[PDB]
Amino acid sequence: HTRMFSVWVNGVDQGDGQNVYIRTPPNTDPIKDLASPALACNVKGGEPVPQFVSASAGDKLTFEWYRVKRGDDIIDPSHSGPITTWIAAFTSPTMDGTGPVWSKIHEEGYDASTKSWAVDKLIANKGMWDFTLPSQLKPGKYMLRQEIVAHHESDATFDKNPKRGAQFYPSCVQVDVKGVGGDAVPDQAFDFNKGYKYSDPGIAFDMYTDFDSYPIPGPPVWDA
C-alpha cells in the first residue's frame, strides 16, 4: 500500500498533484489481476486530471510517494520489489494507458552487491524516487507511469491463488514536455495486459530462497 503525493522538477516540488496532474486512485489498494484494465494506470486511470507537470526533456523528475500521510513510512517494508518508470504519448484525455503504447525509461530491481531492492531504497530516501526524462524526447504531452511491485506474496501467482500474487502499485502522471531538440518518439509500444504474464520469472518470483538476482519484467530500457 502506497501512492504518489507530488512530482518534483529538478528538486523543486510542484505541490500536491493528487487529482491535479496525478491520476490518483481512490485508495492504496494493490492491482493483482494481470487482465485488469487498472494494471496500467490504476482504478481511475481513464479519468482526465486537469493539469500537466511542466518539465523539459532532460530534467530530473522526482516522484514522491506516501502510505497514509505525506512523509510517513511510505510503504510496508514487507513489500520488497522493483520500481519501473514508463512513458506513453498522451493520445487524448480519456486514455487509460491500456493497449500497446508504453516504453520503459527507468528501472531498479535487486542490487545483489548490497542485497537491497528498489523499495528498500524508496523507503531510505523517504519516498523520493528520481529518474531522468530522456533529453532526446520529442516535445509534447506524455503520460509517465511509475510502478512499485511488491513480491512478499509472489511465491504464488494470482491465477492459481487469488489471495496471494505480485502486487502492482501504478501511478500515472500527466506531463507536458518542453523541447530543447529531441526527435525521439517512444516506440516499444508495450502493453501491460498482454506483456505481463504469470509465467514471468519476474512475476512468479519466490523471495524466500537464496536468489542472487531478479529479472525485471518487460523490455530493457528504451534508447533511441
**Interacting residues with Cu ion (CB under 5 A):** 1
**In 3D, which of 118, 107, 104 has the Cα closest to residue 191?**
104
Min dist. Cβ of residue 29 to Cu ion (A): 8
Residue closer to Cu ion, measured from CB, 30 or 218 = 30
The strands making up 12-13's β-sheet, listed across from edge to edge, are: 12-13, 3-9, 60-66, 128-132
Write the DSSP symbol of residue 4. E
In sequence order, what DSSP letters do the residues of 106-131 get, joined into one string? EEE-EETTTTEEHHHHHHHTTTEEEE
Min dist. Cβ of residue 99 to Cu ion (A): 27
Q: Is 106 annotated as a binding residue?
A: no
Q: Is 72 annotated as a binding residue?
A: no
Min dist. Cβ of residue 75 to Cu ion (A): 7
Q: Is 151 annotated as a binding residue?
A: no
Helix (H) and strand (E) counts for the chain? 3, 11
Q: Is 29 annotated as a binding residue?
A: no
Report d(CA 28, CA 99) in Å as an integer: 24
Residue closer to Cu ion, measured from CB, 36 or 54 = 36
Residue closer to Cu ion, measured from CB, 1 or 44 = 1
Position closest to Cu ion via CB = 1
Residue closer to Cu ion, measured from CB, 158 or 222 = 158
Report d(CA 63, CA 31) in Å as an integer: 19
Q: Is 111 annotated as a binding residue?
A: no
Q: Which residues are annotated as a binding site?
A: 1, 45, 76, 78-79, 152, 155, 169
Q: Which residues are annotated as a binding site for Cu(2+)?
A: 1, 79, 169
